[PDB]
Write a protein that binds this ligand. Sequence first.
Ligand SMILES: *[C@@H]1O[C@H](CO)[C@@H](O[C@@H]2O[C@H](C(=O)O)[C@@H](O[C@@H]3O[C@@H](C(=O)O)[C@@H](O[C@@H]4O[C@H](C(=O)O)[C@@H](O)[C@H](O)[C@H]4OS(=O)(=O)O)[C@H](OS(=O)(=O)O)[C@H]3O)[C@H](O)[C@H]2O)[C@H](O)[C@H]1O
Ligand SMILES: *[C@@H]1O[C@H](CO)[C@@H](O[C@@H]2O[C@H](C(=O)O)[C@@H](O[C@@H]3O[C@@H](C(=O)O)[C@@H](O[C@@H]4O[C@H](C(=O)O)[C@@H](O)[C@H](O)[C@H]4OS(=O)(=O)O)[C@H](OS(=O)(=O)O)[C@H]3O)[C@H](O)[C@H]2O)[C@H](O)[C@H]1O
Lengths: 48, 179, 48
Amino acid sequence: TGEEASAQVSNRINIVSAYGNVXXXXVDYVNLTVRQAAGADNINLXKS
Amino acid sequence: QVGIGTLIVFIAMVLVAAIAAGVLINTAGYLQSKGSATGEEASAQVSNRINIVSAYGNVXXXXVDYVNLTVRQAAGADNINLXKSTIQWIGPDXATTLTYXXXXXXXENFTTXSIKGXXXXVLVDQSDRIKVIMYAXXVXXXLXXGXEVQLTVTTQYGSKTTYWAQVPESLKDKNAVXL
Amino acid sequence: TIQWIGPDXATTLTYXXXXXXXXXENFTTXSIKGXXXXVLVDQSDRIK
Ligand SMILES: *[C@@H]1O[C@H](CO)[C@@H](O[C@@H]2O[C@H](C(=O)O)[C@@H](O[C@@H]3O[C@@H](C(=O)O)[C@@H](O[C@@H]4O[C@H](C(=O)O)[C@@H](O)[C@H](O)[C@H]4OS(=O)(=O)O)[C@H](OS(=O)(=O)O)[C@H]3O)[C@H](O)[C@H]2O)[C@H](O)[C@H]1O
Ligand SMILES: *[C@@H]1O[C@H](CO)[C@@H](O[C@@H]2O[C@H](C(=O)O)[C@@H](O[C@@H]3O[C@@H](C(=O)O)[C@@H](O[C@@H]4O[C@H](C(=O)O)[C@@H](O)[C@H](O)[C@H]4OS(=O)(=O)O)[C@H](OS(=O)(=O)O)[C@H]3O)[C@H](O)[C@H]2O)[C@H](O)[C@H]1O
């Protein structure tokens, strides 16, 4: 319990910026650039 | 315990302060770029201007059928492109807004010719004069003796220069006049 | 069991079989992450 609780609080994703392609007159994609927060461990982006 | 409880909360508080410090600096980042751009463009609006040196036109039969303007850089202005610029024509008949027609005689458009300089559309230097060419019988009817025209040469940045072109009282025995 | 202290009623909702749009005073669970759609196995499971 002690290990998992600290992992819950600390392991976090930080979003740097967001951009998307635009065709004709409508945004057809939404892309984000993410990074792990301060002191975080390995963050798998499939179980997320 | 209180020792265990304190450490977990302390971990959260530095993260919260990190987020709080994050928004403050980044918001200042956007305001920096927006502020700097506003200062430059506003300064360019006041400074970059056009001065009309003199105006003249051809005389056929008994009607001034061209209006030619000799423009020059204003005091302290930067490059003045004459294609992205526009000129208003409040004549005795029509009241339209002319634009650049690349190469012409020009219907409802104006042309340049470069009196002096290394460009025929840009006022790069301070000593370079460009001739703005305007067709009278194309934008409207051929000007008659007395018909005054009001012209405002609007630069891209927004600065305006107004010149009132007044055809001489009598057009007898003269091939060209000074409007 | 889920207790619904709402603005009008106040009941205790129990689970019902896969019956959406007809779920009266019951609640239904549709899986979001995982193989099981009624039980949370590991930390990565998410159920709606
Ligand atoms: C969010 O981020 C995603 C990241 O993928 C991004 O998605 C891409 O957007 C591209 C564009 O719309 O910006 C798409 O580009 C097209 O497909 C590429 C590829 O095939 O996937 C490239 O394809 C070649 O294009 C040439 C060209 O002459 O058109 C064609 O001969 C042929 O379709 C392809 O030939 S190839 O290169 O020999 O394979 C090309 O883009 S490029 O690689 O940047 O030059 C585009 O045709 C891309 O498919 C898409 O996944 C979103 O846009 C973001 O919002
Ligand atoms: C305002 O500024 C504009 C700037 O364009 C100016 O426009 C010009 O005005 C000239 C004149 O009316 O002052 C026009 O001149 C005529 O056309 C020229 C050219 O063809 O465009 C020249 O034409 C030749 O002249 C010979 C000559 O012996 O007279 C003739 O054989 C024949 O007309 C033409 O033969 S050619 O060259 O083989 O084609 C001539 O003017 S010139 O070049 O100055 O000597 C005139 O005939 C000119 O067309 C027009 O753009 C306005 O006048 C200003 O008010």
